[PDB]
Amino acid sequence: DRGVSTFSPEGRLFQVEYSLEAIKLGSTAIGIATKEGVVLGVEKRATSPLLESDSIEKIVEIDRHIGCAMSGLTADARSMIEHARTAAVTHNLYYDEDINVESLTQSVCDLALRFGEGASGEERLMSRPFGVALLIAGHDADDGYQLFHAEPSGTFYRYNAKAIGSGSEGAQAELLNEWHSSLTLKEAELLVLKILKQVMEEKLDENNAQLSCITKQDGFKIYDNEKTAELIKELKEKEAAE
Template sequence: MSDRYSFSLTTFSPSGKLVQIEYALNAVAQGVTSIGIKATNGIVIATEKKTASPLIDDSSLEKEIGAKIQESLQRIPTNGNASEGGYDETGPALYQVDPSGSYWAWKASAIGKNMVNAKTFLEKRYNDEIELEDAVHTSILTLKEGFEGQMTENSIEIGIIGGDTAGFTEGKQQPFFRKLTPSEVRDYLANIA
């Protein structure tokens, strides 16, 4: 009996809350801002690119991000602590997943330090007919609202998830993920400035 009681004390607070989940949610709220937007023809995921130290090798972060998004394309919804996007049987899908395993489908969402302001901005700008090109612009404008410092092609990352219109398997679109190159991001930034 004492083992079960001690397990409960390490998992739950005296008020019955799962403390570990609250800590995880607070950590996410303090992280970099990330935006997810569902378009009619895909998903845009954009994030600030910040490292905790100038000694961190930024190229290793890119490989981890690309691999994670590609992996998530195969299993939507996923358990984790992020916005996840991809295609399901109905087309593009954007989910926000919290550490408890709860998830919600969104048209547009934000996580991170500036998520409240970003969600307010998205509520004003989002429409159900938005396409990938406009969703990229909207994601940049949303990040720009609360961005600290200068926004450049090296300080943000943008990925798009779309359906391959040329390749169908049993009548279903094949999803793809592509991270925009720094040159492409620079072009988008030039058009917004």
């Protein structure tokens, strides 16, 4: 056949490029970083009405100051979150402090290219790359509120606002116009809901959509269905005005 870590004539890794196609099939995940906090939102996408939407866990806590959102093969993210939770706690044990968001993202991204049938370098025991993209968001005293996009390629970019999933290309173009450096936390909350509504196949409500924020004061908190429903109602009224 062909090696898993094989380069294409163009200069790209086959398996990594094919992994990005799997993320395109995944549910939409949007993050917006402001000076008041970083807001993360995902699409639940229930395959059946009998499926309990609250069990869908696409927003996870890494540490009190770091949150995460996933898109694509969500099962592949579980060991990545496990490593992230370990790296955050292990740093706290070694240095009696909080891990930097950039340092935490770097630790997760080091696992990405560790795949092959026996690549000469270390002991990279994995048959294939991760089929999931992560939106790592948090806060530290050094660089403040941050939003990162962790790729299966091992590369990570710091975004002011990033959208990943099925409607990622349409969402990113919308985030390009809407984002400004003076956005408030509440303005970012209605914005995540606005763009999600535009890219979701189903009508947006408190069941098929979930919000989360990370602040310096309260830390990472997942929005309950009662709190989110009021924000959907507020977003519906403001769009009805003009």
